Design a protein around this motif. Structure first.
Motif, mmCIF file in Angstrom:
data_model
loop_
_atom_site.group_PDB
_atom_site.id
_atom_site.type_symbol
_atom_site.label_atom_id
_atom_site.label_comp_id
_atom_site.label_asym_id
_atom_site.label_seq_id
_atom_site.Cartn_x
_atom_site.Cartn_y
_atom_site.Cartn_z
ATOM 1 N N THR A 36 0.803 -1.175 0.011
ATOM 2 C CA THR A 36 0.122 0.138 -0.022
ATOM 3 C C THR A 36 0.704 1.116 0.039
ATOM 4 N N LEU A 66 -1.124 5.192 5.618
ATOM 5 C CA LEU A 66 -1.234 3.993 4.645
ATOM 6 C C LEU A 66 -1.765 4.408 3.409
ATOM 7 N N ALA A 85 3.412 6.960 18.523
ATOM 8 C CA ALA A 85 2.631 6.206 17.747
ATOM 9 C C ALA A 85 3.028 4.845 17.279
ATOM 10 N N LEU A 86 2.224 3.891 17.182
ATOM 11 C CA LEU A 86 2.973 2.478 16.887
ATOM 12 C C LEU A 86 2.678 2.284 15.566
ATOM 13 N N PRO A 87 3.712 2.021 14.691
ATOM 14 C CA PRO A 87 3.385 2.186 13.167
ATOM 15 C C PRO A 87 3.012 0.680 12.745
ATOM 16 N N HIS A 88 2.967 -0.177 13.579
ATOM 17 C CA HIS A 88 2.697 -1.519 13.211
ATOM 18 C C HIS A 88 1.139 -2.023 13.548
ATOM 19 N N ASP A 102 0.941 -3.443 22.775
ATOM 20 C CA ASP A 102 1.439 -4.355 24.045
ATOM 21 C C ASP A 102 0.717 -4.367 25.038
ATOM 22 N N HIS A 104 9.556 2.746 19.814
ATOM 23 C CA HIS A 104 8.688 3.173 18.683
ATOM 24 C C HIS A 104 8.745 4.443 18.228
ATOM 25 N N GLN A 105 8.166 4.510 16.942
ATOM 26 C CA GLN A 105 8.281 5.822 16.061
ATOM 27 C C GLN A 105 7.353 7.027 17.065
#
Ligand SMILES: Nc1ncnc2c1ncn2[C@@H]1O[C@H](COP(=O)(O)OP(=O)(O)O)[C@@H](O)[C@H]1O
Ligand SMILES: Nc1ncnc2c1ncn2[C@@H]1O[C@H](COP(=O)(O)OP(=O)(O)O)[C@@H](O)[C@H]1O
Ligand SMILES: Nc1ncnc2c1ncn2[C@@H]1O[C@H](COP(=O)(O)OP(=O)(O)O)[C@@H](O)[C@H]1O
Ligand SMILES: Nc1ncnc2c1ncn2[C@@H]1O[C@H](COP(=O)(O)OP(=O)(O)O)[C@@H](O)[C@H]1O
Ligand SMILES: Nc1ncnc2c1ncn2[C@@H]1O[C@H](COP(=O)(O)OP(=O)(O)O)[C@@H](O)[C@H]1O
Ligand SMILES: [Mg+2]
Ligand SMILES: [Mg+2]
Ligand SMILES: [Mg+2]
Ligand SMILES: [Mg+2]
Ligand SMILES: [Mg+2]
Lengths: 370, 370, 370, 370, 370
Positions: B190, C106, C166-169, C282, D36-37
Motif C-alpha cells: 500500500t 497508509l 504512535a505504534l506504526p505496526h 503491548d 517506537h516511532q
C-alpha cells in the motif's frame, strides 16, 4: 605370559606391557555419563563413556573422576575403567597375564583390599602385585638412594630410601596435587572475567594449566613484575574460539605448591615437606639424601619447580650439604617405567600374589605380601 | 500396515507415506466458507471447501487457516483438513496405518493432548507418534550434529542438537514466519498503491512474496542502490490482468527476518537467535555447532538467505571458527523427508503410542512418550 | 506571517488559519462541469464550477470528487480546489504563508510527493508540512494517550498512540466511510421505491443521510421493532417537493460500519478493527488504550454511535477494563482543530519543510521529514 | 556529613542513608530506551527513562538491566542509574557524603576498579568503601558465626564466616538466581499457552513469580498432587485484563534452585552448595556453621524455602548435628541494613578510601583496601 | 608471701598455689594465631590467643606448642603463656609470690638459664626455684625411695633414688611420650580412612587417644583377637558429627611405649629403660628399687601399662626379686602435688634463689643452686 603394568593413578591411567619404556594406554581416567535429553533413534548412544572417548564428547557428559585424592571413592566405575583398559585399549584377556597395580602410600586398607579382590574375582588374573607409587620412581631413575617426590592430580609423597631400605616413618603424604591446583586456577581466573564452572570447562582449565602455567623463581618479585605488562600475558584459544590473556594468574596456580596458605591448607609447601622428611631421617643419611631428590609425577613438569625446589631447600639445609634435584625429562612416566622395570627382574617372580595364595588367605593377604 | 507421515505445518499440509522421499499431498491448509449468496437450484455448493478446492475458488470464499502461529486455534476445521487429507488425497484407511504427526517445539500441552485425542477418537489409528519439527530435519539431512532453523510460515525455532542429545534449555522459538512476512508485504505494498485487503488477495500477496522476493546481501546498501532505478524492479501479473511493479519492497519483505523491528517485534533477527541459541550451549560444543546450521522450512527458501545468514553470523562469531550453512535445495519438504526416514527405522517401531496405551492411561501419555 | 492549515479531506475541505478554533472555509470538494448544451450569450457562463458554487447548481453539472478513497485520483481538479480555497475564501498570498496539509496513514507515496511538488511549484508557499490525520485529532483533544478513529467520505483508520509514540505496526486502515455509506443508502433506498442514480441524486442522498440516519443500539431489536410500523419513519422533503419516508433503512445505512458484509466487504466492522488494533499493541499499553477511544471525522457523528461502539467493544474486551469513548461534540472538525493547535506551537516551527530544503534535495524530502 | 549505603545489586538499587534501617529509594535498576516511532511535537519526550519511571512506561521502552549476573556489563547506563539514585532520589550532593557500595564475591577485578574510578572521577565523593554482600548480611543479623546465602536476582554465594574470620577458600558463587528463575518461568508458562516474549512482559512474568510462586516441601509429591486438581490453581490478572491460571508451574519456578538440572546447569542446587561450602571448612567449625545458615537476598523470600532447605540439609548432614536456618522476615533488605550498620561503626570509620589515597595510587587501591 | 608452684610441662600447664593438693590452673599450653582473613570492625579479634581460650576458637588458629620435647623452643610465646597463667588465670602479682618452676632432667642449660632470666628480668618474682620433675613425684608419693617414671607429652625419664640421694648416672631419658604417640596415632588412623592433618584435627586425635586408647597385655594375643572381630571397636564422635570406629589401632597407639621400633626409634621401650636404669645402680640398691616404680605424668594413665609394665619387668628382673608398680590415681598431677608439698616445707625455705643472689651472681647461679 608377559607381565602387565598398569599405573592406575588418580589422573590419567598409564598402562602398558612390561619390558618397554612407554605405556600404550595414556587416557584420562574419567567416566562420563550423559545428562541431556537424547532424541535420535538410529544412533547407538552409549549410556556411559570412559577415557578419551568421554574426553572428546564432553559437551554432553557429566565427567566423574573415580579416584579423589589418591583413594578410590567410587568403585562401580573404576571397574569399568579397568575393563576398558584391559580390553578396548590393550586387547589382552587378563586371565593370561600377571598384573602390577600401584597405590600411593598412606591410603586406607579398604582401597588396596578391594582393588585386589576386584582384580582376582572379576578379571581372574593369575598374579597381581601392588607396589608403592613412589618406589618405582627410584627403580626407574636407576638409583637406590633418594628422597622421591611424587605428585600429580591426587596426592604428593616424600618417600626417603637410603639403600633400598625405605623409612616408613618419614613418608610425608600430602594431598595438594594438580587437582587442587586446577580447582584454584578455575577460581583465580574468575578475578579476570572468564567463568568456567562445569566439568567440561574444568578440563579446559586443566589444559590451560598444562600448556600455559609455569612456576616462578621468586614469587614476591614476579608479582611486582606483573604490575607493568611484560611477556607474562599469553593468549590461549578456548575450544569455542574466544581467547584468554592470563598474565598474573599463571605463576600463582603452581606456586600454591610452595605456598599452601592460598587454597586454605595449613601444611607447609612441597619444599618444606621434603625437608621435614629428611630431618626425620638419621644423621648418617641426611648428608646424602640431600643430594638426590628424585622427582616424579605429572605436576612436577612445570618449567619452574625443577629449579626452584633446589633454592627453597638450600634456604633450609645447612650451607655445607650438597643439594641436587634429579629432574629427569621423562618424569611424567617414571612411575610406570619403574613398574615395567621391576616386573621384568627375575628376583621379583617370588613377589607375586599367586591366585592360590589369595584363595587360601582371602583378600587380606596383600597387607603382608606387599 | 505402512506408516503415515504428515507434517501439518501452518501453511501447506505435507502428507505422504513412509520410506518414500516425496509427500503425496502438498496442499495449503485453509478452510473456506462461502460468504456471498448462492442462487442456483442445482449447484451443490458444499458449505466448506478445504485445501486446493478453496484455493481455486477464492473469489467466493472466506479463507481461514486453522493453525495460527503453530498452535491450533480452530479445531472443527483442522479435523476436516485431516479427514480430507486421509480420505481424498491419500485415499487410505486410517485404522490401518501408523501416523507420525509433527509439532514445533515449545507449543502448549493442550495442543498435543487434543491432537492425539482426535487421532485416537476420529480416525482410530492403531498408533500415532509426534515429534519435534527440528529433529526430522537432521533425520533428513543425515546428521546428528546440527542447529536447525525450521521456519515454515508459522514459527521459527533453532533446536541445537550435538550428538543425538538435544539441548532443551537452549532452543529459541520465534513467533515470526512466512505469514508475518506476508502480512508485512500486503502492508508495504500500500506504500506504492496496490491495495490487497481481503484474504483472496492475501493469497496473491503470498504468491508475490514466494517468487519475486529475495534477501539482500547488504540491506542498507540495497536501499540506496534501488533508490536510483536499476534492474531491481519486477512485474507480477495478477490473476485479474493488471500488472504491478514491486521495485523496492521485495528485499524488505524478507528483511523482517533479520530486523524484526519493522513489524514491531522487539526480538532479534533469525541471525541472532541462532547465535544466542549457540552461546547458550557448552564450550566443547559451540565449535561444531557453528559448522552445521541446517536450515529447514519454507521461509528459508529465499534466493539470498543462505548467504546473508552466514555473513551475519560471521559478523559476531569468533574469528577463528568455521561457519557453514547446510542448505539442501530440497529443504521445503525436509521435515517430511526426515519424518519418512524416521518412520522407516527398525529401532523406531517401539516408540509408537499404541492405541492400547492411550486407552489404558489416557491422552496424557504423549507428554511422557515424546 | 502566520501559517495555514487545510485538512483536504475527501469530502468537505476544511481550511483556516493557525490559531483559531474554526475553519474559515468549509465546502464540499466537488468539481463539476456543465453537461447539457447551454445557449445564453449574455449570461456569465463559467467553465468549471468548484466547491459550494458547484454544490448549489447540480441539475446542470456533473460532479466529481478528486479525492476518492482518501487518495487523490485526479490532479488537475484538486489543484483547482486548492486554488479556489486559497483565492476565494482565504484570499491569502500563498507565498507569504506556510501550509499544513493532512493525510490518512497508509497512503501511496505518490500523494505525498505530488502534494509537495504542487505546493512548491504552483503556490510557492515557504514551508509545507503534511501530518497524519490522527495525531492531529489527539492534539485537538489535548491528550497524549488515545486510539484515534477518523472516518469520512471514504477512509477509516485507528492509529494507536501511547505517549506520542504512535505504534506504526498497529494502524488499521479501512475504506468504509461516509461515501460508501451514501453509496449503500442510495442502493437500499431503491427497495422502498425511490430512485436516486445521478450525482445530484447522490448529493440528495447524502443530505438525507446526514440528518435522518442514526446508529441502532441493538440491530436485531430494531429490525424486529420497525418490522411492525411505528414512529421510526421520518418524512424527508426533497428540493423538488416530493416527500419520502425512509422508515427502516435509516439505521441499516450506518450499520454497515459494524457489519461490512452489506457492501460485500470482508474486513471487520469498526467495532472490531479497534479491538484488533489494540490487541496488536503491548500489554502494558492496552489497559489505558482501552480508556481513550477518541473518535474523529464526520461519520462518527451518528446520534447513537458513541454508545453502540462502547457496547460492542465491551462485548469483546476483558471484563475488568474501563472503556471510555471520548466523543466530543466538536469532533467533525477535530483534525483541523488539531492542525491549528500543532501548527501554533513554539517548538513546531523547526518541523516545517522549508522551500530551500525542497530546492536542494527534491520532493522526496517528506518521506524523511514526516 | 553522613555516609551513604547503596546496595547496588543486580535487581533493585536499594540505597539510603546510614544509621537508619530502611532504604529510602528502592527501584528496579533498568534503563529504558524508547523504540517506537514517537510523533508528538508537544511532549518533552525524555530519551532515556530509568528506574520506576521506566517501569511505569514499559509498553514503549526497551528495558535493559545494566548488570548481568552480578557483574556490570554496560557501564554507560549504570552511570546514569547512579546519577538518578543520587540526585533525583536522595537529593544530596555526592561530594558531601561518604559512599558504601557493595559487590558480590568472586567478581572480576575490572568491575571493582571501574566502579571506584567512576565513584571518584564522576561524583568526587570524599571517601568510598565497597564490601562483600554477605559480611553485611551478618552485620545485619547480628551474629558473627554464620554461613550466608545472599542470593538475589543474578547471583548466589555462600560465604562461611566462623568468628569474624571469613574462609575465602569456601565461597560457592552460583549464577542461578531470580533472573534465571524468571527466564525459566517465562519459558515454562508456554506449557499452557501464555506467551510472554518482550521485556515489558518479562517484568510481568517476574511479578507473577514474586507473588504466586512458592517452594514445594516435597517436589515429587507435589507433582503427583497436581495431577488431580486441587488448590494448586491460582489466578493472576495481567495488566491487560485477561487472567491466567498457573496451576502446576508455580512450584517448578523456584524448584530450579534445588534442581538446577532444569535450566541445564550442572552445579548442584543451593541446598548442596551450602553443604559443600561447609564440608570445605574445618572439623571443629562445621559444628556451629551447621547451626546458623543466615539467609539474605530477594530470592530467599519464597514461602517454602526455609523449610525445604533445612530438610535437604538434614538429609545429608550428620544425624547428631543441630541444623537451624536463620530466616529473618526482613531479609529482602538485610544486605542494606548490614551496610547501614557497618557504616555506623567507629572502628570502620577509619577504613574508608579517601580521595587522597586513590589520587595518590590510582584505582588499584581497592584490591588491597577491601 | 605464699609460694607459687607452676609446673611447665610440654602439654597442659599445671599452675597453682602451694599447700593445696590440686592445681588451680590446668589448660593446654598452646599459643594460637589466626590464619584466615578477618572481615569485621566491631569484633576485638585478638592477634594471638593463648591457653584454652585458644582451644574453643580452634578452627581459625594455627596452634603452636612452645615446648617441643621438654626443651623450650620458642620463647616469645612461652613468655605469653606465663603471662596468661600469672595474670588471667590466677590474678596474682609475680613480684608478690615465690615461684617454683620445674624441668625434665638432661635438658640444655640455656633453657633453665633463660627461664630464670625471664622470671627475674621480666616478671621480677621475689625468689624462684626449679626442681627436677621426678623428685617432686617422689615427694607427692610420700616416699624417699623409688625409680620414678615420668612420661607425659614430651620426654620420658627415670630418676632412681635410693634414700634422698639421687643417682645422676642412671637418669635414662627418652623422648617417646604423648606427643609422639599422637603423631603416630594420626598416622595409623590414615590406614582406616579418617584423615587428620591440621593441628586443629591433631587436637581431636589427641582427644581420641585420651579417652579411647588402652595398653594391651599380650600385644600379639590382642592382635590375633582383632582379626576375628571382637568388642574392641568403639565409636568416637568427632565435633564434625560423624563417628569413627577405631578397632585395631587403640592398643597400637600406646604400645609404641613398649615397642619403639614403630616410630623408627631404636632405644628400648619404657619397660626396659627402667630395667637399664636399675642395672646402672648398685647391687645393694636394685633389690629395693625393684619394689618402688613410682609412676607419674599423663601418658602413664592408660587402662593398660601398670599391669603390663609389671609383667614386662618381672620378665627381665631376676626371679626372687619382688616387683611392685606404685600407680596412684592422681599421677596426672603428681609432679605438681609434689611441688606444693615441697614449697611448703621448712628446710626448703633456704633453697630459694632470691632476686638478691641472682643479681650479684648472674643468671648462672641456678647451675649451683639446683
Ligand atoms: N606438561 C605438564 N605441565 C604441568 N602439569 C602437567 C603436565 N601434564 C600433566 N600435568 C598435570 O599432572 C597431572 C598428571 O599426573 P599423573 O602423574 O599422570 O597422575 P597419575 O599419578 O594419576 O597418573 C595432570 O592432571 C595435570 O594436572
Ligand atoms: N519458493 C519460495 N520462496 C520463498 N518463500 C517460499 C517459497 N515457497 C514457500 N515459501 C514460503 O514458505 C511457506 C511454506 O513453508 P512450509 O515449510 O510449507 O510451512 P509449514 O512448515 O507450515 O508447512 C509459505 O507460506 C511461503 O511464505
Ligand atoms: N450530522 C452528520 N451526521 C452524520 N454524518 C455526517 C454529518 N455531517 C457529516 N457527515 C458525514 O461526514 C462526512 C464528512 O467528513 P469529512 O470531515 O469530509 O472527513 P475528513 O475529515 O476526512 O475530511 C460527510 O461525507 C458525511 O457523510
Ligand atoms: N516477595 C518475593 N517473593 C519471592 N521472590 C521475590 C520477592 N521479591 C523479590 N523476589 C525476587 O528477588 C529478586 C530481587 O532480589 P534482591 O535481593 O532485591 O536483588 P539485589 O540483590 O540485586 O537487590 C527479584 O528479581 C525477584 O525475582
Ligand atoms: N586420661 C588420659 N589417658 C591417657 N592419656 C592421657 C590422659 N590424660 C592425658 N593424657 C596424655 O598425657 C599428656 C599430659 O601429660 P602431662 O604430664 O600433663 O604433660 P606435662 O608433663 O607437659 O604437664 C597429654 O598430652 C595426653 O597425651
Ligand atoms: Mg599418584
Ligand atoms: Mg514448520
Ligand atoms: Mg479523513
Ligand atoms: Mg545481591
Ligand atoms: Mg609432666
Amino acid at each position: 605370559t608377559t607381565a602387565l603394568v598398569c599405573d592406575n593413578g588418580s589422573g590419567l591411567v598409564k598402562a602398558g606391557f612390561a619390558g618397554d619404556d612407554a605405556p600404550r594406554a595414556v587416557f584420562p581416567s574419567i567416566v562420563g555419563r550423559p545428562r541431556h535429553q537424547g532424541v535420535m533413534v538410529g544412533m547407538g548412544q552409549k549410556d556411559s563413556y570412559v577415557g578419551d572417548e568421554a574426553q572428546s564428547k564432553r559437551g554432553i557428559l557429566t565427567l566423574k573422576y573415580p579416584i579423589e585424592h589418591g583413594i578410590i571413592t567410587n568403585w562401580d566405575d573404576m571397574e569399568k575403567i579397568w575393563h576398558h583398559t584391559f580390553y578396548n585399549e590393550l586387547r589382552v584377556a587378563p586371565e593370561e597375564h600377571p598384573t602390577l597395580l600401584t597405590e600411593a602410600p598412606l591410603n586406607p586398607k579398604a582401597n588396596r583390599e578391594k582393588m585386589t579382590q576386584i582384580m582376582f574375582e572379576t578379571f581372574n588374573v593369575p598374579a597381581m602385585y601392588v607396589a608403592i607409587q613412589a618406589v618405582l620412581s627410584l627403580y626407574a631413575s636407576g638409583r637406590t638412594t633418594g628422597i622421591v617426590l611424587d605428585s600429580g592430580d591426587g596426592v604428593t609423597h616424600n618417600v626417603p630410601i637410603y639403600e633400598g631400605y625405605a623409612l616408613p616413618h618419614a613418608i610425608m603424604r600430602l594431598d595438594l596435587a594438580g587437582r587442587d591446583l586446577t580447582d584454584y586456577l578455575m577460581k583465580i581466573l574468575t578475578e579476570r572475567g572468564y567463568s568456567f564452572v562445569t566439568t567440561a570447562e574444568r578440563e579446559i582449565v586443566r589444559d590451560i594449566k598444562e600448556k600455559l602455567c609455569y612456576v616462578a623463581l621468586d614469587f614476591e618479585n614476579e608479582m611486582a613484575t606483573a604490575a607493568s605488562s611484560s611477556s607474562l600475558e599469553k593468549s590461549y584459544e578456548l575450544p569455542d574460539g574466544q581467547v584468554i590473556t592470563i598474565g598474573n594468574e599463571r605463576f600463582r596456580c603452581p606456586e600454591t605448591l610452595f605456598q599452601p596458605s592460598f587454597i586454605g591448607m595449613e601444611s607447609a609447601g612441597i619444599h618444606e615437606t621434603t625437608y621435614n622428611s629428611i630431618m626425620k631421617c638419621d644423621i648418617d643419611i641426611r648428608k646424602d639424601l640431600y643430594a638426590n631428590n628424585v622427582m616424579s609425577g605429572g605436576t612436577t613438569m612445570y618449567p619452574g619447580i625443577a629449579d626452584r625446589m633446589q633454592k627453597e631447600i638450600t634456604a633450609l639445609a645447612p650451607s655445607t650439604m650438597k643439594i641436587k634435584i634429579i629432574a629427569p625429562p621423562e618424569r611424567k612416566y617414571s612411575v610406570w617405567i619403574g613398574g615395567s622395570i621391576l616386573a621384568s627382574l627375575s628376583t621379583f617372580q617370588q613377589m607375586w600374589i599367586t591366585k592360590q595364595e589369595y584363595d587360601e588367605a582371602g583378600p587380606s593377604i596383600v597387607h603382608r605380601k606387599c
